[PDB]
Amino acid sequence: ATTTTHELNVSNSMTVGQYSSDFTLNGFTFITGGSIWEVDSSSRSYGGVNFTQRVKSGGKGTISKRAISFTASGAGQLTVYAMSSGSTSRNVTLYGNGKDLESFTAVQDVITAMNFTIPNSGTYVIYPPDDGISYYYLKVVKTD
């Protein structure tokens, strides 16, 4: 039994553009570290859902650059739909409790569904350590 507490479908909650200052949307905080966050058109499907926009990091980053953070009120699961923005496989890393906790490989051309464990309440950071990542969908689910 779980409760969905955060959701961000980029196709429904963002619009095409370029953003250079940190902002919060649907409970997710987009952290520039002096780079641009960009929303553009990109059609990809996963699990019977069709997406039409992505938010892309524009390159590699850290927990303070091209990062996405959120605060969880308890243990649960974070879902990330992500694609490498180029032809090489690239990590998406979850940071929390003071450390890199878990990484998931994003591949070229298609969405990977990434299921990240949220072990406890707190603030967590999604970042791309290798190179640019395209994000389509984020969801946080809290264990009841």
mmCIF file of N, CA and C in Angstrom, residues 23 34 38 68 76 101 103 108-109 112 120 130:
data_model
loop_
_atom_site.group_PDB
_atom_site.id
_atom_site.type_symbol
_atom_site.label_atom_id
_atom_site.label_comp_id
_atom_site.label_asym_id
_atom_site.label_seq_id
_atom_site.Cartn_x
_atom_site.Cartn_y
_atom_site.Cartn_z
ATOM 1 N N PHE A 23 14.499 26.761 -9.830
ATOM 2 C CA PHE A 23 13.055 26.874 -9.673
ATOM 3 C C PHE A 23 12.507 25.556 -9.160
ATOM 4 N N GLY A 34 24.615 27.195 -12.534
ATOM 5 C CA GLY A 34 25.107 28.082 -13.573
ATOM 6 C C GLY A 34 24.909 27.598 -14.995
ATOM 7 N N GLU A 38 16.783 22.907 -20.067
ATOM 8 C CA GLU A 38 16.043 23.131 -21.304
ATOM 9 C C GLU A 38 14.934 22.101 -21.484
ATOM 10 N N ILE A 68 18.304 17.626 -9.960
ATOM 11 C CA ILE A 68 16.897 17.726 -9.585
ATOM 12 C C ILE A 68 16.708 17.167 -8.176
ATOM 13 N N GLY A 76 10.056 5.087 0.531
ATOM 14 C CA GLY A 76 9.255 4.833 -0.647
ATOM 15 C C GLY A 76 10.070 4.534 -1.886
ATOM 16 N N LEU A 101 23.736 6.936 -3.478
ATOM 17 C CA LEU A 101 23.042 5.760 -2.985
ATOM 18 C C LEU A 101 22.877 4.685 -4.044
ATOM 19 N N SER A 103 22.691 4.084 -8.705
ATOM 20 C CA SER A 103 22.756 4.597 -10.068
ATOM 21 C C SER A 103 22.028 3.642 -10.996
ATOM 22 N N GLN A 108 20.757 4.910 -25.096
ATOM 23 C CA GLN A 108 20.320 5.794 -26.184
ATOM 24 C C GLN A 108 18.923 5.435 -26.688
ATOM 25 N N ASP A 109 18.249 6.440 -27.249
ATOM 26 C CA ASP A 109 17.100 6.299 -28.137
ATOM 27 C C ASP A 109 15.796 5.909 -27.452
ATOM 28 N N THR A 112 14.426 4.454 -20.324
ATOM 29 C CA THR A 112 14.604 3.454 -19.269
ATOM 30 C C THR A 112 13.779 3.862 -18.052
ATOM 31 N N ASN A 120 14.338 6.585 3.486
ATOM 32 C CA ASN A 120 13.814 7.297 4.649
ATOM 33 C C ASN A 120 13.433 8.709 4.218
ATOM 34 N N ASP A 130 27.771 11.464 -15.892
ATOM 35 C CA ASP A 130 28.592 11.164 -17.065
ATOM 36 C C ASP A 130 28.421 12.176 -18.192
#
